[PDB]
């Protein structure tokens, strides 16, 4: 129940890694969803790949 804007999160340089599967970061601004879930946790750096 909101208007999202993924260009602000994307253009921001603060992120160390950014991998989208199935979607491309520049198309996220047009596409919309039934729901979005944010699964949030901290891991060890070498484990980011997992």
């Amino acid at each position: 129940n909101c208007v999202a804007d993924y260009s602000v999160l994307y253009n921001s340089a603060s992120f160390s890694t950014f991998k989208c599967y199935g979607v491309s970061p520049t198309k996220l601004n047009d596409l919309c969803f039934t729901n979005v879930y944010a699964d949030s946790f901290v891991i060890r750096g070498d484990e980011v790949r997992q």
């Binding site: 253009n11 340089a13 491309s24 970061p25 520049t26």
Partner: protein, 49 residues
């Protein structure tokens, strides 16, 4: 700096064709391109319409 990349460099300052033939050669620099108090002679495009 690779074909089929997007980002603040790929879209605003250096875009390669996605059909690119050639080689990307890179190395770290720390003798010339960096100083104490930072090297502020390096500019990039941060916003473009």
């Amino acid at each position: 700096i690779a074909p089929c990349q997007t980002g603040k460099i790929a879209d605003y300052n250096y875009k390669l064709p996605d059909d690119f033939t050639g080689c990307v050669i890179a190395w770290n620099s720390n003798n010339l391109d960096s100083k104490v108090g930072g090297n502020y002679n390096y500019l990039y495009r941060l916003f473009r319409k």
